[model samples]
Target chain A: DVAPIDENLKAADSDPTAPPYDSLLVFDYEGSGSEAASLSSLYDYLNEWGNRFKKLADMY
Target chain B: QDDAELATRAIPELTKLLNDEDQVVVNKAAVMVHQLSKKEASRHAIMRSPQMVSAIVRTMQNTNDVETARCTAGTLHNLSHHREGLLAIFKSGGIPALVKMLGSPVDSVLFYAITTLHNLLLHQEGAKMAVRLAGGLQKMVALLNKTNVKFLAITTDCLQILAYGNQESKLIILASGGPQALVNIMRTYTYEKLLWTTSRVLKVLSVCSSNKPAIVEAGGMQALGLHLTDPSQRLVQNCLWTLRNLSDAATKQEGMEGLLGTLVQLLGSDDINVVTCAAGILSNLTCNNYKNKMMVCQVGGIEALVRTVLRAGDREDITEPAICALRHLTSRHQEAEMAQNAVRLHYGLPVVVKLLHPPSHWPLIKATVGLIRNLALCPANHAPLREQGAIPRLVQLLVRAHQDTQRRTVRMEEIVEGCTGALHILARDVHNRIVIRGLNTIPLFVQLLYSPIENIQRVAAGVLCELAQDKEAAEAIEAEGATAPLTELLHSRNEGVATYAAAVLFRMS
Candidate 1:
């Protein structure tokens, strides 16, 4: 039940004037919108605050 | 190599003149020797002959001439760089003799003597002890106050090294009235280097519990508070440390009251130590002192303490004192509600709420949670505390034992009591009641109803009693079989426990 790599790796762009999209912005984890502001901000928050709550969030 | 050869060739004739009966010739020769000790090439040649060092000390002790004294002391001071020279200075009876020169009426001679002794103290452990044994302690303590501010740096530098970690020196310095004299220098000195060393010495000296009262009596609080405005971060840090040591004894002092504005301003610094030390002092000074707590609050102090909490994250050093100060500032006053309202008016409630976030130091979480309970006493803050993101954090504390370490120091009961107490107060609002219901917290409250901590059990029953009246929450309570813990508590030993437990079940029926 595997999909073709080319179609699955990147989503198709609908606009005619769009440039070729090389990659997708894939996130490994999900939480608040505030966490998704920038990659480094999340990394620092996780690094400093640790993942105790993050693990709790994922437990469900 | 050529300079070495030249120094060796010229040293012997100068050595002969160093011991000569002519003071003028010895003065010229001492200058040459001092200059020789300045360079690496000639320094080896100069320290090679202990007899040459002896002759310089001899001329230094015997001569009443100012230039002869200055150059000889300067030569010995310069010789302090090398190990061999340190031995030579010691072998020539230089340590105590240098202490004697601390009494030289000439400023240049005094400067050279103290600076040289300061260098020796850095290189040898015996140097500090030697200075103390030779009556240098009293001499230096006396010299801490002088008309000319110029000599302040050298004397303070010596005391700083002497009392660094040495217990005997601290006792002697404290006994010699060192704290009062040093506070005198702190009160007057304007030069940065001198101010730095003076405050640095006071910080070290005040480590002894007995020294704090003297420092406060000598105007140490006001003098130290004044330096908090200085541009030097290092100096300001030293001053704050001294203030922290003096904090308890000076709690009732008139001078500490003068620094609340500065302490509030210090909370906004970018440097971490400045803010932490400031918060620490505020915590100590504000404990049980309503005037201090109110005054600090009146001048926007709550905002500064709140900002400290804003960036504290998981840093206990930053959060613990700030939370304690916030607790003291907002509690135990005739105008306690006004103080609590001050924190709310300054936009501080939301920042403080952030401290309840999971994965924090236990003391920080405990102090922070306790502070929230006190802050929640003001019903005006009930809505803002919820909107500022307190409920989920309190819920997080409830679930699966929140702690930064596996070995927790604060018992689960203590922390849970604070969490539920704040929530119980927050539940007084209609909107917050719905929010608590939406978080699905009734099952957790019912779980607490049978928990062994009677205080927590009382508050838990109180929370459930209020929520049991609501339709959504009452339905959740019924589905969870809430009557089990409530029936268990009706036969409880504590009076409040039986009363509130009956209240929750009364509503559930």
Candidate 2:
């Protein structure tokens, strides 16, 4: 069997087997392995989410 | 034999290790000698070899090999353990290297680097210059916004040191989110990590008692109580110990009920260390009032303490604090007879007398003395205590104890206060022979007037006035050297001491 290719294949392979990551973890790590943002980061991430989550819902 | 020889060899070896390529070896070498450098000769050896000290200082800035860099930075911490060596490290350009490491890219490298800076700032002049030269005050404040544990711990430690060691450092710590960092550390860290770091902050805060309100303002009291009842015994002990220090802190009064509940529960903990700490915090909690004292009883603290004393022989350390807290708690209640009966029925006097003899623990003996004295206030209990042989044991303890213990023992004060308390009980419940027997306690009570601690001396003088209601006890205090010290205490700036001393003198005259 050939391995799947492309960004979606790679992204899908990244954590497809593991349980879905919590949105908090994604915001904290910024989807990478560096140190989580400070408490202030949590507040900022939430603020950015309010607008982004609403816009994505309206488009859908 | 080799410890001495190694001490001599370590001087040059440490210098050589500073520039070594193997980070592991250098780090190990630094850790190995770090404790040794605490000794005077070893420290002097490092100081004398300024070139070597300078090399270590230089390597503290090497971020590429973070391990070696941390080890090199730690030498400053070793040197800073003593005053003279700390000055020597500062003279060797340790400050700039320390500042450079504070700005290091790696998380943990910055931790050791910040720790080195904290130690450097322990020296008064190094703190001042580092603040100016490294923009240290500014940079440390900037790092507070960073989320890593190692960084936060380092930031809190350095800020606390700066806040305590210098006035300017206090402003810097405050501006650099010092209070916020401390509260965050208190809330998030595991019990052990907080124990180690909190102690550092507490030691710093102790020196700046004026800043206690700021600590409370920063959420110290609210955050502090969360760990007060932790299942981890060491965590509970350290948390309560730290909270005891924040008793007079500027924390909001709203948190007191929660804090009190946690403190009371801890007093009954299965762990002796936790119970010991809980008793101490209870003493602090009840420092002001009857309501707090009754609250302690309602929480079953008195019963827990009684159980502790009943189990005293089982563990030496826990028994003393349990006894001490019980003794202090009863003093605040209006139900003196109930308290007195509790002591007599529990076989408290016999246990106390048993604790006083050889193989006796000093703390247990101290608490026992306090409890017996308080118990002796009741005329009915005196015969039992006398029968159990409390007086001779107490007199012996008074004569044999070290100067500090003689002055500070809860039992010694209890004996003094007990005699007066006995006089009160006798004035109501018994009579003249008891007062005469109590006169034996007068000379020792008078002697406490000369204690080195002003507060102790004040309490001693106050006890004298309580005894002075009887002419014999009054005459004994006058015959002893109580007058001079009592007068000094009367003139003391501490209002409580001055007020108590004056009241004693007015009654004596």
The best candidate in terms of lDDT: 1
Clashing pairs in 2: B370-B411
Q: Across residues B1-509, which tens digit of lDDT does each residue of candidate 1 receive? A: 78788777566657887887866667766766776678888888878877788888888888888888888888887788678888788878898788889899988888888777766776765777777788887888888767555466767767777777666787888888898788877787788777877787788766776667788888898999988988887678788877877776666777566688899898998888788778888887777677887788888788788877777667777778888788777666566678788778877787678767656666677777767767777889987888798878887786545232134366666677767866776776778888887887887788777676677786787677667767667667878888887888889876556666666666666
**Can you tell me the DockQ of model 2?**
0.01
Q: What value of lDDT does candidate 2 attain over all alpha carbons?
A: 0.56
Which segments of model 1 are wrong by more than 4 Å? A1-60, B1-44, B58-71, B81-87, B105-108, B122-135, B207-210, B245-249, B311-316, B399-409, B430-509
DockQ of 1: 0.01
Q: Model 2, B1-509: lDDT tens per residue?
A: 55455456566655676557766545555554455556666666776677667777766665366666655666666676567666767777777767777777766567666665655654447465665556776787677667665656556555545544455665556655666666677777773543445445543553354545666677776777777656555445545555656654431255566777777776656776566656655655554345665666666666666766676565765665566566655553676456667666765667766776767665566556556656665667766766676555555555454243555333444334333333323333234335434547566666766666554554455456556656665666677766777788766765555655665566566
TM-score of every model versus the real structure: 0.70, 0.47
Compared with the true structure, the alpha-carbon lDDT of candidate 1 equals 0.72
Q: Pick the candidate with the highest TM-score.
A: 1
lDDT of 1 at B62: 80
